[PDB]
């Protein structure tokens, strides 16, 4: 009897859903068929309209306090919540209704975790992260824009195997994935350590894989698994492909100035 997952979508770009299905270990096919029961997820579910609505009532009843609520995106508080409408009603109402009987709540990505691109200034919809709306339930934050596929399924696999939320840091993120900064194990560190930096795009330094600090890399202040686990079954990561980290797993990264402005106080790193 597989654990039900109700996957809700607020204001979002659907990139977290897409990242999830890229997972190789385990395959998304194997999680959906053999590990979880993915009963509500507007991206892939057969039913629509009233028939889709009816699913939520059914699984909350039968599996009360034994389903996981996964949330992608977030609720807006402006426009009376109607900048995200589901079933003719504000998304925040659906969020609160499904959350109340969930065993655990997963905030997928930077949107759900922290506010995301829509909460960047001046935040016209007053998009608000899940944990600032649901205050009485256990929430695990899985940030990143989107998070790595294997981090997403890795959280799921852990919760399914042990029936527990993994150990979280102060900000509510799982330590098994977010304990290191990109800068800790970045393969370009030796260059940083010797003061070997790219100064302009495609200069000689860039062609030698020199550190991207002076091009704005936010790896020194960004917690994620990108430098070790890496992306799309370990194929690359932003820095390996030549662009600095933009800090996409961190709270409010859209409003920490230009992505190409270097961090100040290089001595601290």
């Amino acid at each position: 009897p597989r654990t039900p997952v109700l996957w809700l979508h607020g204001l979002e770009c659907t990139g977290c859903s897409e990242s999830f299905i890229r997972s190789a270990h385990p395959l998304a096919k194997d999680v959906v068929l053999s590990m979880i029961s993915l009963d509500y997820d507007d991206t892939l579910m057969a039913a629509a309209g009233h028939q889709a609505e009816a699913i939520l009532e059914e699984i909350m009843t039968k599996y009360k306090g034994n389903y996981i609520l996964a949330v992608e995106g977030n609720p807006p508080l402006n426009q009376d919540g109607m900048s995200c409408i589901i079933g003719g009603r504000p998304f925040i109402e659906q969020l609160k209704y499904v959350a109340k009987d969930a065993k655990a709540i997963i905030s997928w990505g930077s949107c759900a975790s922290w506010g995301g691109v829509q909460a960047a200034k001046p935040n016209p919809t007053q998009a608000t992260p899940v944990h600032k709306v649901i205050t009485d339930k256990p929430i695990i934050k899985v940030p990143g824009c989107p998070p790595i596929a294997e981090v997403m399924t890795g959280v799921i696999t852990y919760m399914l195997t042990f029936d527990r939320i993994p150990e979280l840091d102060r900000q509510g993120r799982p330590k098994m994935f977010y304990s290191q900064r990109i800068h800790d194990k970045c393969y370009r560190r030796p260059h940083f350590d010797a003061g070997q930096f790219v100064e302009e795009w495609d200069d000689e330094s860039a062609r030698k894989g020199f550190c991207l600090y002076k091009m704005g890399c936010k790896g020194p202040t960004t917690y994620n698994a990108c430098s070790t686990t890496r992306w799309n079954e370990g194929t690359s990561f932003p820095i390996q492909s030549g662009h600095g980290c933009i800090g996409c797993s961190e709270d409010g990264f859209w409003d920490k100035g230009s992505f190409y402005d270097r961090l100040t106080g290089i001595s601290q790193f």
Partner: protein, 598 residues
């Protein structure tokens, strides 16, 4: 009740609501009215989300814009980044080096294939395929069907199909049907035989496993997928063959090539044949509904020039067709204030004058959530949306005042027209369409022992089947094109050109204190544009008009309906409270609602 574009709109019949519309990206509500015979006589497309990226962008650095607007959508991920860097480059008069152009083309074409294939199998297929019928299919005949539908596809044996069938059986017999829960299985709207059903559900699973490999091309050039990195002035993935420490080397390019070769195989052996087969069978059942505006008015900006910065060499050549006249393609200029314009007469925004449409350089995005007096329900609990007033978060783009359909179908109709006019750059799409028509009309019916038909492309393409067909054909063509781009890239690098970025105008001190730019992209769902105004190094205005904005649009000032609403008209429903036909047709546009509203 009123008439518009040859459609007799009438809201006197039974109102039916579909909210949420599922198996799309983002959030949509659809309402229709049907007559005494369950024929849709009115259709209302409501975009039910908004985030305000255009507002968020104000005052920011143009060089950072791509990353913001990339997060408009993680499905068509990177097409917005492409539009943005093109718009800034256009504003600042920046020419990117040849390698950067080719890498962007390869990234664009990889997105096309991934997006198209995943859409058909994982979002669209369940409108055509009964999964429960697949359970009671004979494994043997399915192998036989597989050999006729695609002889070259080596996963054909009966055990393999039995094995797949059994996992499905055990799955459903658990009582936890997951994504198949409360499905419309057994509707008479499904016409496929068990064997075709099992064949498709099998490819659904194959595509689900394979799709994750294809995007590794994005990962190599752009670091991650979803949301690979882009760059104003070129690409960040600097090149060095030998002279392991650089983003791009020969080994990385060989990897890219191997993925491209796999794509070409999937497209020609799995995706295109399935759609041809499924299309044939639904054509045989007489389900040629859903043409909507495709029968009259189609548009694309035109894309994929085989020589950079020369639009006459576009391999998917664009323009606009009006009134079903495929002998005259009007040129489309995104800079012309009198061509692309957006209205908000029936959208939840406000202008200083809502009787006019604004060209996006003059675009305005001030939210205005207000419901009409004929609304049933309340502001926070809608039962029946009032389409006579403002009813969507989607703006209403038009071209010289005309309502247009955009997307792969529009591009393939435009390519057909261009090719008949003498345009040689569109030969491949033309040959794809004629080959497809001949398969759908004659070859596949003969192989399955069905009667032959004689539909012309004119009759066949303006249909939900045609719209689905065009998407699969476009995936194939894109795979073939990036195969060529890959060789051109490797050739250029070997000749000695390793350049990947033009940084002459990277620093804002070199910029004009005021400038405007536009970037266009043939995104998976149709015609995408970003229009930017730059002032004192900051974004003064940034406006996006996105393909689903075109297709999903509500009515304009004149009351003209958009592509979604038109495509639902004149469609019979087997059962009014099962939205099978609504979903089949809406999904044939591949609705991206986060895109539409951004």
């Amino acid at each position: 009740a009123y008439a518009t574009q040859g459609f007799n709109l009438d809201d006197r019949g039974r109102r039916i609501v579909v909210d949420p519309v599922t198996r799309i990206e983002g959030h949509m509500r659809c309402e229709v009215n049907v007559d005494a015979n369950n024929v849709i006589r009115n259709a209302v497309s409501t975009g039910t989300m908004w985030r305000g990226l255009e507002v968020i962008l104000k005052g920011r650095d143009p060089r950072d814009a791509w990353a913001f607007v990339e997060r408009i959508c993680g499905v068509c991920t990177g097409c917005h980044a492409l539009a943005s860097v093109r718009a800034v480059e256009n504003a600042l008069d920046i020419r990117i080096p040849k390698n950067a152009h080719l890498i962007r083309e390869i990234m664009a074409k990889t997105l096309q294939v991934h997006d198209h294939a995943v859409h058909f199998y994982h979002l669209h297929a369940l409108d055509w395929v009964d999964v429960m019928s697949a359970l009671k299919a004979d494994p043997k005949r399915t192998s036989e069907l597989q050999q006729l539908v695609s002889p070259a596809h080596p996963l054909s044996s009966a055990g393999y199909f039995r094995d797949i069938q059994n996992r499905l059986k055990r799955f459903v017999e658990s009582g936890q049907l997951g994504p198949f829960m409360n499905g419309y299985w057994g509707s008479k709207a499904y016409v496929l035989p068990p064997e075709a059903n099992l064949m498709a559900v099998t490819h659904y699973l194959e595509a689900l496993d394979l799709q994750k490999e294809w995007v590794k091309i994005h990962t190599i050039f752009g670091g991650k997928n979803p949301h690979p990195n882009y760059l104003v002035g070129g690409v960040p993935c600097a090149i060095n063959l030998d002279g392991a420490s650089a983003p791009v080397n020969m080994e990385r390019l060989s990897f890219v090539k191997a993925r491209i070769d796999e794509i070409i195989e999937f497209n020609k052996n799995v995706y295109v044949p399935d759609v041809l087969a499924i299309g044939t069978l639904y054509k045989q059942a007489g389900w040629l509904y859903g043409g909507g505006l495709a029968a009259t008015n189609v548009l694309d900006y035109g894309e994929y020039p085989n020589v950079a910065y020369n639009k006459s060499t576009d391999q998917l050549p664009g323009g606009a067709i009006l009134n079903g006249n495929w002998d005259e393609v009007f040129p489309v200029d995104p800079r012309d204030s009198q061509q692309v314009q957006e209205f908000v007469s029936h959208s939840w925004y406000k202008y200083a004058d809502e009787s006019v449409g604004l060209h996006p350089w003059d675009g305005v995005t001030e939210p205005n959530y207000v419901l009409g007096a004929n609304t049933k329900g309340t502001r926070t609990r809608i039962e029946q949306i009032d389409e006579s007033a403002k009813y969507s978060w989607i703006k209403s783009p038009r071209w010289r005042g005309h309502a247009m359909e955009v997307g792969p179908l529009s591009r393939y109709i435009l390519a057909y027209a261009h090719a008949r006019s003498g345009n040689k750059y569109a030969e491949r799409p033309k040959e794809q369409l004629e080959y497809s028509a001949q398969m759908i009309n004659s070859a596949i019916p003969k192989a399955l022992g069905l009667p032959e038909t004689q539909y012309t492309l004119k009759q066949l393409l303006p249909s939900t089947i045609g719209r689905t067909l065009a998407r699969a054909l476009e995936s194939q063509y894109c795979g073939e094109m990036m195969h060529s781009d890959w060789h051109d890239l490797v050739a250029n690098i070997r000749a000695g050109d390793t350049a990947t970025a033009n940084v002459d105008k990277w620093d804002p001190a070199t910029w004009p204190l005021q400038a405007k730019g536009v970037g266009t992209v043939a995104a998976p769902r149709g015609a995408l544009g970003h229009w930017i105004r730059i002032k004192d190094g900051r974004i003064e205005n940034y406006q996006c008009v996105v393909p689903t904005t075109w297709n999903g649009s509500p009515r304009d000032y004149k009351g003209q309906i958009g592509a979604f609403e038109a495509s639902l008209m004149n469609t019979p429903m087997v059962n009014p409270e099962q939205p099978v036909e609504i979903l089949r047709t809406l999904h044939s546009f591949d609705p991206c609602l986060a895109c539409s509203t951004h």
